[model samples]
Target: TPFGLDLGNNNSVLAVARNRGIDIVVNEVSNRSTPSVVGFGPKNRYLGETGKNKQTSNIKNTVANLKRIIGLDYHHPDFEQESKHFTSKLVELDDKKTGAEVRFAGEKHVFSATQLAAMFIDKVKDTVKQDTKANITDVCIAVPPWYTEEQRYNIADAARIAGLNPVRIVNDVTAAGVSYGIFKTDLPEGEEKPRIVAFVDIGHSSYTCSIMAFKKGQLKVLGTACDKHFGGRDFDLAITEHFADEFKTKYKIDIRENPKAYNRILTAAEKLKKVLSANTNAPFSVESVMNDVDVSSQLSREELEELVKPLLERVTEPVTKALAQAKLSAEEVDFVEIIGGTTRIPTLKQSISEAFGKPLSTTLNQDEAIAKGAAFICAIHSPTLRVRPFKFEDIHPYSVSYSWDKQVEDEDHMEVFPAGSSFPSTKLITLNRTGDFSMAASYTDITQLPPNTPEQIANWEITQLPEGQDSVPVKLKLRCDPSGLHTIEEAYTIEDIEKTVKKDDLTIVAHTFGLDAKKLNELIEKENEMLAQDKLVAETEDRKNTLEEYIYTLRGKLEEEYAPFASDAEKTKLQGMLNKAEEWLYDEGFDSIKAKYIAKYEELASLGNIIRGRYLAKEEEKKQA
Candidate 1:
């Protein structure tokens, strides 16, 4: 049996294929989805809801949005835009090819985007293991269709680090189509025309549209379009900014100055956005938001629709582009299938309906459909399950070529797979080799590829040529499968051994090589050690920072806020302890272990709490009287 993971930016869903059906797996909390977040703690790491709940206090240590930065370089334009949204510190990696890393717990601890993704993937795998009571290995993950070859490979690497074998990394839209196509048993077998549907997905951080044609036993993707910068988050940001200005003018408090205050408002803004999907008006409130000031506000659905009107306009752009690429008009589309969390917005749905001039189709589950399709794909790959025969072909997003040293021709490259070509394809090319040489495979246009993609995809050497031969005729068979694993399946040198020229030629030698298992094991071990060391250092910093913050906060309260209410004796005693802690903090305490600071703060806090609690109770009694 195999598992399927639809890894989203805001949340992730997991499902498994069992007993001839697909079922969504819930976490320990019985929630069908888990928040895509990770946080560094004093003793270990927290994942999912545990980490998300800690975001307010440990804002700089909690990491989210792993999908946006998993394969992006530090200097990429998208990375620059993404970094602005994170409270945690993002640092440049020593390697230019790799993406930026986050500084968690402290500046001394750093982790790459890939490593962060692996941590979350491990958490999901553990959840599946606990629910099914089985050791799961093979998994199929759903990704955006816009992801390049490099991004897909990076996700596979992360899965490997999490101790799971990636059976297939599929596009999200394609997975949705599979989920819908699997249960369509009513379609006639010999139908002349196929059903054409346009899938429009507006998720948390991005939007995608795909045009697919479905037949009885076949599904083919005609084209795909994406808007990397638009999603539900953008709508939330719009609401946040509107309220930030509102509070600044009404309450005379600038929420941006306080990170905690801003974070709280952003959280409320997200909730408000969700509520507006069903209710016309939603109330937003936060206590002691900034400078001990409480703020509350209300927003109506009409107001939010006006605020996000610009975003609503872009929703149909991807749909128009996808249709044009597929050479179909709005009238030609038989149905429009809407997916993703953002489609719940009434205004957004109205816009899409208007663009297509047809009512939207809800044949599939908005949230769990991708994972179900992914589970079906995994079941097809599983050796244990018997599933219906279905053929799926995804188009290549870019053109790739194979190059070798040629004597007579000036051009050394040949396009093996062009853009929009159906995958799971194989091609054979015969070459005349004069001597030992090598073959190279790469993308034809670097600009057309995704950012940070390598120019060279693979290279192989053909050596050990038969001696005393004028020329050797070698045959190379290349195959690219649905999983995106491209390889030279076989290579053979055709030769004839005879006194003179022979009419029949025979194969002299065949060469093949598999991945080195020893090297792979060593690499995995090294990765594990690196992550372990990072956690240890992060924990130490977390302890140090916690004590440091506690001492400062208590000292401030005692000196300015509580001094007037405390008796002289109480003041003197608390002041003495505060002085000692301050002096120790800057002196030997700074260089000592975390336990020393924690111990010192505990002693000071005990004495200060007595005076602070009495003063508050007395004030409350006087007010009641």
Candidate 2:
């Protein structure tokens, strides 16, 4: 089965394509969504739901915002701004990229943002394996549309670290658009006017709008824009800051000084935000928030509206920008569609609806749309499963160009793939090179990108030129592939004298966000060892609990269920045995190893089974009589 993954900032959803349609995979908790959190303790690691539950206690050790930090700079102007949302400590890694520094397994350990994301994905992958019993190797993960090339590369590498071959990293909004395109049977096809729809996805930490034109079996993203810092968390923070201000004045307690207090309130803020969406007003309270002080407050829909007034002003910007880039006005859109949890807010719905001059369409399930659509993308790429032919293309946000050494002809640099071009788009450029040459892929315009986002995407050295040739026609093929990853797919020299005769292939040494082979192997090994350690700890605990429960179980059965079946003499001996086992378990065997606990349980069960055998026999004897 093909898998689709929506790796969101706060939560992630997984879906598998089977039974003629998409089925959302629930986690161990039987919940449709799982928290995108990872935490470490002395014994083992906590993942997903468990990780989210224990985060407050392990404030500095649990890392959230797993999707936001990949391929980020150590000293980006917004580094501190980003860290405000992180519960774990963010640090500059040796490579000058962002990573988390925390105490795991009684030692200070540092994991790059890519590795942190890998751990979370690894755990989620196992969840899918256990749920469906499918050996999930390929997945199409949905990502934000505004992701730069390096961020896209890093996320794909993270998926690789988790032992998956990511078929594609489709844009979140585009995937939702794909779901709309695939399901609705009334879409226009062929020569008819295309149906224009605007997809607005407002999730935990960001907002995105994609303008798309759909026809039967195909959809093209005309334009997309994002407000990278507008979503549920931003609203949650507005509520949190409100409470913090109210607490300082009302209770005279500074909640921000305490991390645990701050975390609990943020969690409460998130809940209250949801509550206010359904009800006109809701009460919010946090127990033992700070300095043993409990706090209580109430917020109304109107109060929340006022608190996020400035945020509301920027809500329609994405709709406007997307329409502008698409070269179509709002009146041209046939329908406005919405996705993501943050869209549940009434004000957001109203603003987006007003922007498109139409009421929003709730045809798609907000939570599962991205994951469900991603499953289709994965299924489309799979030869094993025959799927409905659906063709969708995503637009690249940045204009990228390649620059080479001064050995090229008239122009040393030329833009290969420009902004707003649908991908997987490619352009091949032939260069006359005398010898070995190096080139770099960079953004042609950085002014359109995020703050502190580097224009430098990657560097590559094309070598292995024909030694004797003074100048040769070297063909270099560049691609902005389906997954939104930029690459130099091919570089070669075609030599022709009089007629085409011989050709020489070139070598490429490139440097990007992914780890080198040696380091990737080491990380894989480390993850294996950690996984094994967790399994051992879990099985040992299981055995230990079984022994403890068996002792109590047999003790209770000795008097009530097994009395008539056993004589006093046999019972006296068994009683003594049970007493010894229980005492030993309460004392020296409390923290005993797995094998010892299993041996002790078997030793007692041998005697207890005789009692059980007699009890069952007498019950059968009475029934027959």
Candidate 3:
């Protein structure tokens, strides 16, 4: 079986390919999507809905924004900006990665963003397993289009930490595009003109658009554009800021001075935004937002659109960029498809539709489309599973150049994979090297990437160069795999120009951005330990509840049914035992361990069994009669 995960910033959706179609997996709460929060507590960690429930009061120990911090450096320009979205304190890890300082197990615990993502992923993984009973080994993760190589590697590593082998990391919009390409029946045939469609996704934290060309059996991503700072959160913040200022005057209190108070408005604003989406005017109220005042207000759709005009202005820029990259005009696109929660806004949808000069389509599911698409892609990669023949290719967002030591070639650096090159593609390069040398991969243009994005992607230390009189010809195949990860697939010595053959395999010591092997194993063990601890604690609580329920049920049964059958001595003794156990349960034994609950329950049940014996003997005699 294949699993697909759409790990969004605020929520995550899981989909699996089975039963001849994709099915969305419901969480324990029977919800299609689960919150992405991971919260720490003294006894055990809370994930998903439980984590979300504890997020407000335990704000300091609850970590959100699972998207913003992974692979990000502590000294990055956006650290302070990213810190605002997190309730937990952000700290610098020893590896220079971003970490959250939390209180877990009655002490301070620091978890790297990567670890937090892994913890959340593990929780999601268990949910999938419990719901489907499928051994979910291979997963395809849907990531944002603007995710750089570092983010991709870090996310994949997080998946590894969660014990799932990531088959591919498809761009979020591309996955949605794949879903469209597969499900849509009325499309052009091969070699014919492709039906160009644009996929625009506005998620919680960012917006992305993919210009895709679809045919009968395949789809090619022509271009992609992303605005990292645009989406539902921005809309929520716009409303929050508006109400914050309004409260200052109307309620004579400023929520800006309190993070918790401001957070209340933020949550209320999100709810209001959703309400305003379907209604023209919606009321907003927050109780004890600040200074023990319950402030209330109302905003119409017109007012919300006006308030977020600045954000709305950016809606068309990505469409233009995607068109330019695709080399297609707005009129050339046959349809514009919308996906994501933020796209539900009427004004936002209107602007996006206007950008393509066409009415927006919603044939694909808004929330689970990405997860379904990813799972379908994962099925295509699974060895044991057979899927409908569908071919798809995604483009890299940045150009990559491979630089070698000066001793290697005439030009030390040459751009290998240009920006927007469709991949899972490979290109072979032959370099004449004097001896064992080093090669590095880097972005060709830094200005095009996100702010604080490192120019260097990774460095490879090549070794085992065959001895040659003048120089040795080393052939290396550089590939941008389906997951959008770049690497030198293989390196070997070549013999001749006209004919090519492998001489000896060269070992590559690649230094990529991710956890080392040792650390990954360590983290896996830690996750299992916490998982076991949580399970034991859950069992203890369940046993305690069982004892409590049995005490009440047995007491009632004794008084009504077994009163005449039981000897008075036995009845009084059983009542005394039940009373003591019930009192102990509500008092000292409330927090006792599993063994204590079991022992107490057995002590009460033995005496009750003696009384119940007479009742059962009489019932058996009556039945025979």
User: In model 1, which regions exceed 4 Å deviation?
Assistant: 97-107, 408-411, 446-455, 496-523, 526-625
Worst window of 10 by summed lDDT in candidate 3: 494-503
Q: Per-residue lDDT tens digits of candidate 3, residues 311-360?
A: 77777999999999999999999899988999998888888888888999
True-structure lDDT of candidate 3: 0.88
Name the runs in model 2 displaced over 4 angstroms. 406-408, 464-469, 497-502, 617-625
Query: In candidate 1, what are the lDDT values of residues 57-86, reduced to their tens digit?
Result: 878788888888776777786766687678
TM-score list, all predictions: 0.79, 0.95, 0.94
lDDT of 2 by residue, 1-625 (tens): 7889999999999999999899999999899999999999998989889999999999899999988899788888777768889888888888788999888999999988888998988888988999989798988989998887778888888888888898998889988998898889999978999999999999999999999999999999998989988989999999999999999999999889888989889999999999988998999988999988899889999999999998888988999999999999999999898899999998898889888999899899999999999999999899988987998888776788899987747788999888878789888788888789999989898897777777898899887555476777788888888987778999887876644544777789988766788988888777878878888888999998898788888888987898887788988888898788888888988777889889988998898898899889888989989
Per lDDT, what order, best first? 2, 3, 1
Worst 10 residues of 2 by lDDT: 495-504
lDDT of 1: 0.80
